């Protein structure tokens, strides 16, 4: 992961009987703490707003995220990179329903790969996600990370605020559990918080929805 590393993330998911898959490519610089990505849905239309899944596609991998020198040994995700890890994420939206996702992240060959399966439940018409009222903007966030020896895994928690055209703000609870596929040393950190700052842009060159995405994630 040291230095510039390319990444290709492909995933598929089902929401209320609607199946859609998204594939994307980009690169991350852990030394500079920067991450650049470009996604696209092979399906004609994606039923829900993109941001509710941009968050999942972004926070599915933490290897690229930079950490301070004191926390370099503390990181668990980098330690498990050689043999990968599996994340189970539960997201409870504020009355918009629930996401249940399972992802696998691993360094295949000499390139990093992430795959995700998503299920959406408890969705009703006239909702924010159903109505596509969410704008294209995003917000920075903080994610808290804590160890768990009983499950031999790292658990993350936080709240994500998504925006609505009328201004309505949806506070959704995000919980993550990680299990290292490998049998190596975990080096699980006791407690630490990562601040994420993400900005989204579009390329007028193509008619296809671009979702050109930039992250700067720093631990503390």
């Amino acid at each position, epitope marked *: 992961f040291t230095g510039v590393v390319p990444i290709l993330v492909e995933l598929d998911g089902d929401v209320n009987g609607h199946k859609f898959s998204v594939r994307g490519e980009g690169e991350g610089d852990a030394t500079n703490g920067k991450l650049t990505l470009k996604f696209i849905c092979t399906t004609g239309k994606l039923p829900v707003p993109w941001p509710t899944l941009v968050t999942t596609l972004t926070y599915g991998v933490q290897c690229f995220s930079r950490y301070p020198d004191h926390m370099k040994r503390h990181d668990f995700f980098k330690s498990a990179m050689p043999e990968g890890y599996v994340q189970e994420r539960t997201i409870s939206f504020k009355d918009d329903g629930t996401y249940k996702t399972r992802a696998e992240v691993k360094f295949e060959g000499d390139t990093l790969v992430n795959r995700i399966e998503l299920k959406g439940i408890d969705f009703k018409e006239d909702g924010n996600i159903l109505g596509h009222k969410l704008e294209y903007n*995003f917000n*920075s966030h903080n994610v808290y990370i804590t160890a768990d020896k009983q499950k031999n895994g790292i658990k993350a928690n936080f709240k994500i*605020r998504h*925006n609505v*055209e009328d*201004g309505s*703000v949806q*506070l959704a609870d995000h919980y993550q559990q990680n299990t290292p596929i490998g049998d190596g040393p975990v080096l699980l950190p006791d407690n630490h918080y990562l601040s994420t*700052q993400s900005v989204l842009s579009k390329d007028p060159n193509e008619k296809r929805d671009h979702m050109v995405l930039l992250e700067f994630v720093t631990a503390a």
Partner: nanobody
Amino acid sequence: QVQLVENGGACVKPGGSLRLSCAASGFPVNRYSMRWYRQAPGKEREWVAGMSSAGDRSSYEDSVKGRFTISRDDARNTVYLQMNSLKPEDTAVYYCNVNVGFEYWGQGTQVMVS
């Protein structure tokens, strides 16, 4: 490049009226939505009020709906929030938010009913 400066914070006895004002610099206000969050000492931040980019409608939380009665003027490049009725729950402090490109938080001001 861009900055947000909010003022007008002052202590108010219950039943009084207070006006907060958030001004912007380095970007237009008419082309983007505006928002006002609130957080109490030692409490998680929460979105109390806000106003859509188009300005046709404004959205509040369950408790404060109808209290804030927010307003905006494009030429002034400043947004105004009116306390209207006051309750002790407003002891928490306020923050002014508008995210063009990368997200921006304003320093805001602290207001407590006492």
